[PDB]
Amino acid sequence: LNPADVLPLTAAQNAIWIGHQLDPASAAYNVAAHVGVDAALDADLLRRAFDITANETDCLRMRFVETGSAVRQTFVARAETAFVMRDFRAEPDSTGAAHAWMAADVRRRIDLSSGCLVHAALLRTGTRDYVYLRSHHIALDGFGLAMVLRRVAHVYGALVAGREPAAAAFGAFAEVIDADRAYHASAACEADRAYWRAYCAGLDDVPTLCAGTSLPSEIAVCHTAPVPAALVERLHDFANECGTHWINVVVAAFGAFVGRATSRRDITIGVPMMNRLGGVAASVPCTTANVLPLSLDVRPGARAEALVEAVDTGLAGMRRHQRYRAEDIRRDCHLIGEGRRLTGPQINVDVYTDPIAFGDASGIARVVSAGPADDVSLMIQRGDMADALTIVGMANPALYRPHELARWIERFVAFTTAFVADPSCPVGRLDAYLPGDGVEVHLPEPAKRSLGATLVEVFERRVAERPHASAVTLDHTTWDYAELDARANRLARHFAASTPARGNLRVALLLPRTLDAIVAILATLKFGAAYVPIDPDAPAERIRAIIDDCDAALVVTTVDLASRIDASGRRLVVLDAPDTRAAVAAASAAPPSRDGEGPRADDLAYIIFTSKPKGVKITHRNVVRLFEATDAWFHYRDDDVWTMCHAYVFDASVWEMWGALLHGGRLVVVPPETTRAPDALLELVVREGVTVFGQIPSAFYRFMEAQADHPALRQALRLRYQCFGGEALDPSRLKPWFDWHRDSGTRLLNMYGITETTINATYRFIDERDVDTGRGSLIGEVYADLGIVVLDDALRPVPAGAYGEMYVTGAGLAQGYLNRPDLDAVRFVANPYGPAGTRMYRSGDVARLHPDGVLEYVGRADQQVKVRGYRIELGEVEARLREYAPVSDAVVSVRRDAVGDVQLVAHVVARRVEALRAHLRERVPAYMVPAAFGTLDALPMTRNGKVDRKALPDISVVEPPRDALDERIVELWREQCGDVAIGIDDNFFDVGGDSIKAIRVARALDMPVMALFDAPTVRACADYLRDALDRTLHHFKRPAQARVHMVCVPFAGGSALSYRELARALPDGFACSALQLPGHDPAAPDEAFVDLDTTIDRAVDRLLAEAAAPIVVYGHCAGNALAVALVRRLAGAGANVIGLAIGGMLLDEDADAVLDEVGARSGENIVDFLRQIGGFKDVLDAGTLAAIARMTKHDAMQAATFFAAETRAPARLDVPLHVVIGGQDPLTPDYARRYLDWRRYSDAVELDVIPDGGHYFVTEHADTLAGLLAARWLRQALRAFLNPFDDEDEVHYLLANDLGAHSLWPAFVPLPGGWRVVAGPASRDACLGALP
Ligand SMILES: *P(=O)(O)OCC(C)(C)[C@@H](O)C(=O)NCCC(=O)NCCS
Ligand SMILES: N[C@H](C(=O)O)[C@H](O)Cc1ccc([N+](=O)[O-])cc1
Ligand SMILES: [Cl-]
């Protein structure tokens, strides 16, 4: 008893239907294709064919209607055909007009209840006639269109010759529906289901070539690249070597290309599967297509032939299970929701290879739009000639500009060409990016300055010169250099009495911070030895272990601290012991150098330990090198006075020590008691007249808090420099500092370093400009004799603006780790960029390389965490919390929730909890918002002065509603989801929310449904309603980091939407709005035009409140009238208008005459002329063209009277004017001299030109325009860093240079110049097992 006349939708239909309702203004789900042929086709018989065939089908006889409260489809008495002929043979570019038409036609939405699914055409050009068909994706997919087109072709061919056409092979779509119902009740569905549930079990944050959230709801922007024959020939060769189709090689390359561009191992490619073979759908035009994940593991170590084989099998498994809807995979895996997705970029394995023959001439079937564009999609396509291939890029026009798309295709073709060169080559040797995309790196150059060889040579140099200059100060006591030198020389003779050992030795120091410790360092260095600091408060196990690890010849301590040392047999020197005190005083004060004994430059100086603990071996050369290479920018003065605020176990102390004593300055030992009390520190620094001052950023924040409460002192300062240490800066917190010392002359010096590169590797001067721009933590540029490269997980350089790990090549590299060669081998590694046997150092710190050459420090990758769905650096979040005014500093930790995965927790310190959340949700995404906070006096200081995250107090369901609005919504979600306790902040799709249930809600709330997908929390739902609620002014983007707000006035006949293509070609430095004149929406034409002064008046009111920045008004064609009238009426309103931009207009000599000319023409005449210069080319129906003609004359009459009224001596409005004319515009002739006629409105006018642009350049050339407008008036996501040197599963070489260093190296990377293989391919543990 099943009927024939009203049928349910298939599972494929039901999904297109939903997508069609999500943006009711969108044509995105239409489909279209054409067939070019060289022949003259009969127009009347061709529509007979379309109309015959359309009735031979079923899906094209359908109209759709809602019921069941689902959606049903009903047949129609007759198949409507919409057929048009258009002859472009009279335009100069006929072929480009035809493609222009087709691109416009496919952008007209279809009313599924209309019942009109067939819009066809015959488009005649000089070479080819194009047979064109569009429809809606619900009734046809790509392969269906081609079926219908082959049938039209057959019917046509018969009709010309008066033959009877052969019977249709088309089956009935009603038994496709039974089959679909059958399958979803079968076992195969529950098999296929669990195949994908497993296959996709891991998928999280699928990669894309651009970071994007919102679901694609718009037609693609295309680019078409021919493939060179040489490459086509090589794919078939490369394919036969691997035993597969050539099309699989291309999938493999494209998959490898995504991985190599994102530097990510987990790649998921969407593949449309035809899903027709094997069943009844083969013969029936319909939509069965399914876009499914292809997961590849793109290892930098993987050979090309291997990935091609992964594709071969992955697709094989896809084709087995392909009947299971990908939309249901996505619902099952909870990948529908906030920015979540199943498939990434797409490519097709189904190419239309069969020429379709209309009469005596064949053509190729080419597809204009198959669906909404998600990230990037490639479509393989053939040519009219045999063995010819072409790529068609298709992208989401919201995320990708047309030149950005062309670039990826250009990059890709070159990558493919390299990919098929050697099947045995690993992809990790291949670069996705082209040379133009890279940034020049600083190559190490020698430093032309010289001080000396060792530290003692250069220090002794300074005692000769100025022996009575002051050296060190502790509390009230001060010593000149000569006394300091003598005291050290005396203690260094005592060392030589107290051990027989000689050579480069190691002397452990357990000491308080006092002058004994300064003397003991110098003594150690004078004696030919290296100092090994230990903190007197260290745990006794660590003292024990350091001493044994360095095999101390001597241990130098005090009477009180000697009790912290075992009786192990080590020799001690106790400085404050009265007998030892005297034994040294009686010693000769002559230098050991006077006897010919001292360190060499390559001998060690100190060994500092990091966190088991690892010791770092530094040389005299390393340290003096630092200062030799920094004199250029830093300019060391002998009258500087430095500050030692940092423990001697931390290499800051080496910097702030030898900064004075190499150069002639006086060092101030700051007791640790006063360093942790920021007020007295400020007392002490001014009192003692300090110049150079080091601090760790978290400490400096506590320091300004003291500068606040004591203005007496802060204006008494005299600092040549203010320096920043081994954390990252958050310049946002520096606002109050420039409010004080902007004119003091004190610079701000930021220095990135790490203990393995000799204290510091980079410098930036922080000025008043870059505090509030917020470009991130900026570490500046590399020291002269160092170098830094930023590399991907394959050890290749990353392009401009991309994450990577920093590798420090240079001469500040430590000799290595103490007794850990295995660390020397995986940390200090062979250097491909540089001289033969040199080596590079893994920082493990993440960085971006910006195109100008500055480095942005992003964070240490060890500590990068992952919350639900997202990887986040804790340092970007700790910054977001310092923006909130009372927040001074903060720290974020992590903990494991209940019986759950992960959550964030923050500890903030005040200056002078729920208000923080509010400010935060307006700032950051919901995923960054810590779970719960805590109030703390200060932050746990670490032994070396950093934030101790291991001591933080541990501070251990979902949040309820707020106002009556919220609960009003919550019960509505239960209506759909049921009685499941939901939280205000919960996600709708995780709590049982269905894809359809979300339309029912956003209906009930009268809100766009895309809003809810992109943000499925009832908080965002409420906040959308109350915080938002006849719109005179249309906003495109109002970003937060916006300097300039561009308000745009449309041309004649245009709406505000004509600036959209500009608004998203404009950098995010700009905010862009357009004012919508009434009656100018061709969709709602039935309101009434208004005059100038009214529009201008109602546009200041909304615009004084809604302006996001200083305004720059843009005008085009007749909009320039309303533009100048705007800047003028703003200027008087007490508004921030800084300028005006004038497109496509020159002032007219006789304004009285244009006004008499315009009033004498019909709008229908004005528009027909604008259409011949290339306007309104996308308007294909007479009804809306009529509407536009009416607007056109209004806008023209209004502009003409305006410029007629105010004459040749206007009211001078006095701003700068940016005049932009297109060089092909017939309405701006003789522009070279005539632009100057705009001087009438102000003194400063400058011209820009777009030579190949015409009058409508604001649309066609928009990219070029934003380039101009930004010149004058003015990202991917965070990935996982998998370092190949740490990759257990790969194979490794162990290398050697001639001078005895060893390095681990991955097999897949080519060998560096000066390095030799000591151990054949093996595992990581094996290779490290082979070092002697
Ligand atoms: P809901 O879970 O159904 O999500 C809405 C959706 C728009 C994401 C979903 O309906 C969908 O993916 N529709 C697209 C259908 C489609 O594009 N078919 C073409 C396959 S070749
Ligand atoms: N190597 C250390 C680390 O590994 O974190 C720091 O980066 C070094 C440092 C340099 C300069 C200053 N300072 O204050 O001038 C403090 C700290
Ligand atoms: Cl290791």
Numbering used by the authors: 4 to 72, 77 to 618, 623 to 923, 929 to 972, 978 to 1050, 1059 to 1303, 1313 to 1370
Per the authors:
Obafluorin is an N-acyl-α-amino-β-lactone with broad spectrum antimicrobial activity. NRPSs contain multiple catalytic domains joined in one or more multidomain proteins that operate in an assembly line fashion to produce a peptide from standard and nonproteinogenic amino acids. The C domain is presumably responsible for amide bond formation while the TE domain catalyzes cyclization to the β-lactone and product release, enabling turnover of the ObiF catalytic cycle. To identify the structural features that govern NRPS-catalyzed obafluorin biosynthesis and to further establish the mechanism outlined previously, we present the X-ray crystal structure of holo-ObiF1 from B. diffusa.
To continue our studies of NRPS systems, we obtained an X-ray crystal structure (3.0 Å) of holo-ObiF1. The most striking difference of the ObiF1 structure and previous examples of NRPS modules is that the N-terminal portion of the terminal MLP domain is threaded through the interface formed between the A and C domains to associate with and activate the A domain. Salt-bridging interactions occur between Asp1324 (MLP domain) and Arg853 (A domain) and between Arg1317 (MLP domain) and Asp804 (A domain). Surprisingly, the C-terminal MLP binds to the upstream A domain of ObiF1 through the archetypical MLP-A domain interaction. This interaction motif comprises two MLP tryptophan residues (Trp1343 and Trp1353) that form a pocket around an A domain alanine (Ala841). The ObiF1 structure is unique as the C-terminal MLP domain serves to ‘anchor’ the TE domain to the core of the module. The ObiF1 A domain adopts the adenylate-forming conformation. The specificity-conferring residues of ObiF1 form the hydrophobic pocket for the p-NO2-phenyl group of the substrate and make no interactions with the polar or charged functional groups along the substrate backbone. We observed a hydrogen bonding network of the catalytic triad at residues Cys1146, His1284, and Asp1254.
